[model samples]
Target: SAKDERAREILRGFKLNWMNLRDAETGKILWQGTEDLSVPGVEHEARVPKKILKCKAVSRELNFSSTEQMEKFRLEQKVYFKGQCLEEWFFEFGFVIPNSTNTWQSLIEAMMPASVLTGNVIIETKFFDDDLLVSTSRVRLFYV
Candidate 1:
């Protein structure tokens, strides 16, 4: 029924051909700008930022007990910019296997940027052990 609150920085290794910010909930335009004005022969339609934004989402807890339950969660995800690896660009998420981390590491992997598209990022997921001694970064919720 909703998207979670998230916070992150627009930092290094980020780029774009064009970008404009909007209200995350209402999808209204906030500010717009774009390009390399000094480069004589370059495309000047959009301006890139040295640092673009620091933002937040007011999230609520999403708790689910199994893979199937978590699978149905949806958010409108899209790459915000065009670049060399557009497929793995911004606003992409999926699941991942947990070989190096703990029981729920696989779940956390779903919500992060990865060096490779090695796994998945999950939404609406909490501790998934069902009835086990669930220790997870699926958020610190301990009761069911």
Candidate 2:
């Protein structure tokens, strides 16, 4: 519940255009952005780089132990990973996978920093050994 909530809250106000989103993991398409400026969420739409996001349920230990779990989680991943491949406008620069550097844990880190950002940006993600090791930047837990 926490992961799902945290993930969604982190991506709030971030619009999605599945029509434009192309997943590299399995060539699967994501949420289709209405593309209507009139739409509330679409009104402030900003385009980022290639990212994949799937929304799913999880557990307390936060462990996913099977390929099916990973695939299921991947397919339903909540955060939009910085999608792979080269771009057209940036084509003159040939091609570069900037988001390629991002992993699930690292993505969470990026999100935490830009957490203070006023606008939108790319947030890529990765799951460590299938959540055997959860990484999302770093935040200290207070016991007070």
Candidate 3:
């Protein structure tokens, strides 16, 4: 039938045995030919409705006594996205002087060049000089 012929016809031709793709922000190769899809065969892709992926985020804080303690501090890091672990990130406060510079923005600057981060990002300062024990204020909990 003509309808069936049209449905099977190649509207536009594209031949590929290998392909690689990456995102602008993450700057990591998310997809590659040999890794993601391999072929000596031809495969046709069907058009499907676009899906808008959504994610959830939450904030938390923890206290520390001194710079050394904060540097060595560890928390049971976990994140549940749609009931799956999506990893979680956080910010710190009160551990630095000239307060404004010790915010999330500053951390972003420090984490920019280095795509990966370590546990030693805690705020370091002389603010804890006299206090025997200073808290980081309210340490929050997982929200979703």
Candidate 4:
């Protein structure tokens, strides 16, 4: 009927395709034909409710003194951020959030720029394959 036709018609207008951006914060086009944020105060955008179109991730080695220290550090890390614990022996780690200097143009008008997080800490650990003696290394933590 007319209702179904209207709904289908509106949905037909939407399109989705693969797209890449050079820089999320600056919108500097490093890839093929791209667009940078030209409008003022419009460059950096807060997090949104619907979806995140782009993101960046970096990984590094962890430093810890001993087995016990590493175990304790893992607990603290989990408590520090809203993340899930690992199941097997080794697992991924680190906290990631929107960077104030870096940003996204929010599609959601009701929400503010994503929460700028300052409570992230890095934890490095090394295991003693043979014995617990070498696992006594001190824990080393730093910013990402």
Instruction: Quote each prediction's TM-score.
Output: 0.18, 0.20, 0.21, 0.19
Q: How well does candidate 4 match the true structure, expressed as C-alpha RMSD?
A: 23.6
Report each candidate's C-alpha RMSD, comma-separated, in the order given.
20.0, 19.5, 25.7, 23.6
Ranking by TM-score: 3, 2, 4, 1
What stretches of model 1 exceed 4 Å from their correct place? 1-15, 36-144
Q: Write the per-residue lDDT of candidate 4 for residues 1-144, one digit (tens) a residue.
A: 664553333223311122232444454542321222111223222222212223342121222212111111121212122232321133322221221111222111111123322122112222222222122112211212
Better of 1 and 3 by lDDT: 3
lDDT for residue 65 in candidate 4, whole number 0-100: 19
- Candidate 2 lDDT by residue in tens digits, 1-98: 87665444323322222223334344444323444221222123444322322312111111112211121122112233233221111001112132
Ranking by lDDT: 2, 4, 3, 1
Q: Output the TM-score of candidate 4.
A: 0.19
Deviation in Å, model 2, residue 139 alpha carbon:
30
Model 2 TM: 0.20
